């Protein structure tokens, strides 16, 4: 069943990704197995510029966090729910 399962989890907004993490914990606990994580990462800022006109003579810090989910004993219902769910637009649910 490819039992060695790695998940990294990106977070721009912490509330939306905590909601998605609670949904992952729910859809992992309602199928039989037990889930581990997140063990979160500290503040990893980004280097992203804006499209603004230059001055003739915004944002700089993007607080992104990472979360870790390890699965070692899955079921077929667990991976089915991981292949029959829906998510919010713009966030990553990448099962590494």
């Amino acid at each position: 069943q490819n039992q060695r399962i790695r998940i990294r989890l990106k977070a721009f907004d912490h509330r939306l990704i905590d909601q998605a993490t609670a949904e992952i914990v729910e859809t992992a606990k309602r199928t039989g197995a037990q889930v581990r994580g997140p063990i979160p990462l500290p503040t990893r800022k980004e280097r992203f510029t804006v499209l603004i006109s230059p001055h003739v003579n915004d944002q700089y810090e993007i607080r992104t966090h990472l979360r870790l989910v390890d699965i070692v004993e899955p079921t077929e219902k667990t991976v089915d729910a991981l292949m029959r769910l829906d998510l919010a637009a713009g966030v990553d649910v990448q099962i590494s």
């Binding site: 912490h14 509330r15 914990v25 994580g37 997140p38 063990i39 979160p40 500290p42 810090e61």
Partner: protein
């Protein structure tokens, strides 16, 4: 005055208690997995055990302390803020070897590096309104 092992143990305790309060499992099994599968070579073992035991025995105590300070929040209460406030108030309730300003400084560092860019002022406000009440001596 303190090495980096105490800071690493404190950050790993923040991660382990957030994982416990969000995954909602047994504290002993998650603690054994976190001590036998993660980076624990620079983690103080006794600090980790005493901090997690104090948080686990004062869940309801720190929730009763947090309950009068959940009114003026614009959004609802998050989990990272709750973990930072629980660990910060247990480090300002019964810990004698950790100083007052040192625990407040480490709590502000944890709230700025883990909570949000806007929730660390909430953490500092709850600490400034709770730590003179819990510790009038400020030790």
């Amino acid at each position: 005055m303190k090495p980096a092992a105490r800071r690493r143990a404190r950050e790993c305790a923040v991660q382990a208690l957030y994982s416990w309060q969000l995954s909602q499992n047994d504290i002993a099994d998650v603690e054994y997995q976190f001590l036998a599968e993660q980076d624990v070579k620079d983690v103080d073992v006794l600090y980790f055990r005493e901090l997690l035991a104090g948080v686990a025995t004062n869940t309801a105590y720190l929730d009763g302390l947090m309950k009068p300070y959940l009114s003026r929040l614009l959004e609802e209460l998050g989990q990272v803020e709750k973990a930072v406030l629980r660990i910060a108030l247990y480090e300002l309730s019964k810990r004698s070897d950790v100083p007052y300003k040192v625990a407040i400084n480490e709590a502000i560092e944890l709230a700025k590096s883990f909570g949000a860019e806007d929730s660390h002022k909430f953490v500092n406000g709850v600490l400034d309104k709770a730590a003179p009440v819990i510790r009038p001596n400020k030790k």
